[PDB]
Design a protein around this ligand. Structure first.
Ligand SMILES: [Zn+2]
Length: 164
C-alpha cells in the first residue's frame, strides 16, 4: 500500500540562494528526538521555505517569513563534537523559537548567514543581542534562560564588518 504520485509545481518566486540544509527540530515533551532533517531549503526576500515531498507521512511543510526573524548568526559551538553528519551550523531566531540549521559545508553556512543578515537588516523585529550557544529546551546553554525568547546574552552586530 501507499504507492501513487502527488507532485504539483508549487514553485517559489525569485530565489536568493538554495541548498540541501539540515533542520534540527526543537522537541518538547512529545514523541520527537533532536531530529536532524536534511531537506531542500530555498531563500526568497519574502520567505525561507524547505521541501519534503514525503510519499509516506503527511509531514509538516512549514515556512519562516524573513520578517519573523529576530537574529541570524553562525553557531559558535561550546561543545567538543558537532552531533550531525553536516557541520558548521547557523541559527535563525524567529517569532516562535531559535531554530538550528546545519550546513553541508562552512561555505554554505557563510553565504546563508550572510544573505539572511542582508535581508533582516531592514526588519524592526531584530534583537540588538543574540544567543551564541545551542538553545535546546530547558538546557544549560549560554545564559541558561532557555524557556521563552530571551533578548540575547551576547551583543548582535546586525551590520558586521566582514571587511579585511
Ligand atoms: Zn543566552
Amino acid at each position: 500500500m501507499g504507492h501513487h504520485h502527488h507532485h504539483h509545481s508549487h514553485m517559489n518566486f525569485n530565489t536568493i540562494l538554495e541548498e540541501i540544509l539540515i533542520k534540527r527540530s526543537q522537541q518538547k515533551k512529545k514523541t520527537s528526538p533532536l531530529n536532524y532533517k536534511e531537506r531542500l531549503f530555498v531563500l526568497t526576500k519574502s520567505m525561507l521555505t524547505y521541501y519534503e515531498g514525503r510519499a509516506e507521512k503527511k509531514y509538516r511543510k512549514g515556512f519562516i517569513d524573513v520578517s519573523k526573524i529576530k537574529c541570524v548568526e553562525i553557531v559558535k559551538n561550546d561543545d567538543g563534537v558537532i552531533p550531525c553528519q553536516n557541520k558548521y551550523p547557523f541559527q535563525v531566531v524567529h517569532d516562535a523559537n531559535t531554530l538550528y540549521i546545519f550546513a553541508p559545508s562552512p561555505q554554505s553556512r557563510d553565504l546563508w548567514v550572510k544573505k539572511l543578515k542582508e535581508e533582516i537588516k531592514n526588519n524592526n523585529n531584530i534583537m540588538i543581542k543574540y544567543h551564541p550557544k545551542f538553545w535546546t529546551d530547558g538546557s544549560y546553554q549560554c545564559c541558561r534562560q532557555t524557556e521563552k525568547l530571551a533578548p540575547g546574552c551576547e551583543k548582535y552586530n546586525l551590520f558586521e564588518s566582514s571587511i579585511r
